[PDB]
From a paper:
In this study we show that de novo protein design tools can be employed to design potent and specific minibinder inhibitors of bacterial adhesins, virulence factors critical for colonization and biofilm formation in a broad range of bacterial infections, including UPEC UTI and A. baumannii CAUTI. To investigate this, we sought to design minibinders against three CUP adhesins: [name] from [name], which accounts for 70–90% of UTIs, and Abp1D and Abp2D from Acinetobacter baumannii, which is prevalent in hospital-acquired CAUTIs and is often multidrug resistant. Being able to specifically target minibinders to the substrate binding epitope using RFdiffusion with hotspot conditioning led to neutralizing binders without the need for antibody screening or knowledge of the native substrates.
Uropathogenic [name] (UPEC) expresses type 1 pili, a prototypical CUP pilus, which are tipped with the mannose binding adhesin [name]. UPEC [name] is essential for bacterial attachment to the bladder epithelium via mannosylated glycoproteins. [name] consists of an N-terminal mannose-binding lectin domain and a C-terminal pilin domain that attaches to the rest of the pilus. The lectin domain is an allosteric protein that samples a conformational equilibrium between two well-characterized conformational states: a low-affinity state (LAS, also known as the “Tense” state) and a high-affinity state (HAS, also known as the “Relaxed” state). In the LAS, the body of the [name] lectin domain interacts with the pilin domain, fixing it in place, and allosterically disrupts the mannose binding pocket, resulting in a low affinity for mannose. In the HAS, the lectin domain has little to no interaction with the pilin domain, allowing it to rotate freely relative to the pilin domain, and the mannose binding pocket loops are stably positioned to bind to mannose. The mannose binding pocket consists of three mannose-binding loops, two of which remain largely unchanged between the LAS and HAS conformations. The third binding loop, which is known as the “clamp” loop, is dynamic relative to the stable pocket loops in the LAS but attached to them in the HAS, functioning as a molecular latch that stabilizes the pocket when mannose is present and when interactions between the pilin and lectin domains are disrupted under shear force. LAS binders were likely ranked higher by AF2 metrics because the wider binding pocket of the LAS conformation exposed more hydrophobic residues than that of the HAS. The conversion of [name] HAS to LAS by minibinder F7 shows that computational design allows not only the selection of target epitope but also target conformation.
Residue numbers in the entry:
A (entry chain B): 1 to 164
B (entry chain A): 1 to 68
The structure:
Amino acid sequence: FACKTANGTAIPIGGGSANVYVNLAPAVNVGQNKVVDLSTQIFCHNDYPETITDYVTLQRGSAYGGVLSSFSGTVKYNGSSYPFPTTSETPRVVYNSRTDKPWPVALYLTPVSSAGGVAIKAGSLIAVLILRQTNNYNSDDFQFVWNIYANNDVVVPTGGHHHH
Amino acid sequence: GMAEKEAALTAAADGTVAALAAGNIGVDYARYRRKALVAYAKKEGLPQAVIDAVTARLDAAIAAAEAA
């Protein structure tokens, strides 16, 4: 299992926490604000599918961080919605090919104000995602953490208003 | 056949060493990969000597990354 950001930067798999720098593009919708659509930002594949199939899930305890720590919302994972912070483990995605695939994850924030928003500086921690790998040859697993960092200055709306 | 699976085992082992030397995986994931590649070799019937050489190269790579 190997992944890259949209600008070709390799995401280290395992070790300590990996810092993943992505562009946030918030969108206001009724009762739910998009924070970042990682499927345009993170692309993953299996570098050696002839040897082992990678199964990857998002683990419980994944949540916003940084200045977004106290906010909740929804994570969209492979076409389904789940509470965020996650309280159960998501279904798995299969990597059995060298084909880069978009990571099918996007983060949404539940509005909790009428017109507010939080200023995000580039280099700010936005979310702490916990991932888990399994495979089709043993029962072992490998859990690893992605710190999601904002690559841009942007305002994340916490209400029902666009910020001009 | 078997040699095609041996070439796949060797290529994946070499890619794990290369990724670890580049810093694109951590040692904990390298150890996960080493364990999973040994399971692949055993469940596909690959010669023990190939498993031994692959394991020896991977263990040396893990030791160096530990040091640094």
